[PDB]
Every structure is written in C-alpha cells, then in structure tokens.
Amino acid sequence: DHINLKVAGQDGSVVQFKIKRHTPLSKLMKAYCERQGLSMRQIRFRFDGQPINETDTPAQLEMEDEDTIDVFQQQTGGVYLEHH
Template sequence: MSEEKPKEGVKTENDHINLKVAGQDGSVVQFKIKRHTPLSKLMKAYCERQGLSIRQIRFRFDGQPINESDTPAQVLKKHRQNQIKPCGS
C-alpha cells in the first residue's frame, strides 16, 4: 500500500493552526491562522477586538518576545504550545 501525498496546490488541514491569545485579565481569544501568515495579522485582529493599540502591548510566546514578521511555523518550531500572551507596556 502506498501512502498518498496531498497534491500540489491542494489545501490540507495542516495549512491552518488554532492559536489562543491569553490576556493578562485571564480572557482567551482563539484564532485560526495559516502556518506561514505573519503574526502581525493576528496581533492587529486581537488589538481591534480588545480595543487596544498595537503600540500599547507586547506579545510573548513562552516568555520570549514575538515579532510582527514571525509566523506560527517559525515560533512553533521551537515550542509545542499554542498559546500566545500579550503583555501591557
């Protein structure tokens, strides 16, 4: 039996990842984002939803700062969690 591989250009379930953004107040907002989409998209959406300015907060993953240009694939390569925490400045 041969193992089938996804055809080129065909989206698979692994193209997306569910991430949780946990606020300092204990609130959690869940996002579904493509693995190679810059996290700036998630950061901006979170700030709009919470009524915050992106300049007011910092996002961290496992205690380490996250850059807007980072992607979930880059960040998760080092860690196996799926929760991002914004920190007030």
C-alpha cells in the same frame, strides 16, 4: 495547514484564532488589538516569554495547534509633566 492559537490577556481573557502556518503573525496581532480595542504601543505579545515580531510565522516560531500566546500591558509607572 490550519492551526489554532489562543491569546491569553492579563485579565483572564482568552481569544482563539485560526491561521495558516506561514501567515505573518502581524495579522493575528492587529486582529486581537482591534477586537479588544487597545493601543499596540501599549501591549506586548510573547510566545513562551520571547517577543513576537510582525514578520514571524507560526511555522518559524514552531507553534502548534492550540498553543498559547500571552499578551501583557506595558510596564511604566510614573509620568513626568514638564511645564513651560
């Protein structure tokens, strides 16, 4: 079966996707990452607060048509600049 999922960015952006219930979400993640041009290291995908691993499947996560996935930016702050 096909299912549609929405990926909300922290900037109000929303992107729809269509995949089979048994497709590893890694595809959805590299996809989004490419289209918006971001670094994977710099972002986090979450489904109802819980992380999503590249092997997870919309079926395992028990996602449903039109369910929403959140994407957030890494939370850091400062940067240490060591000299010599």
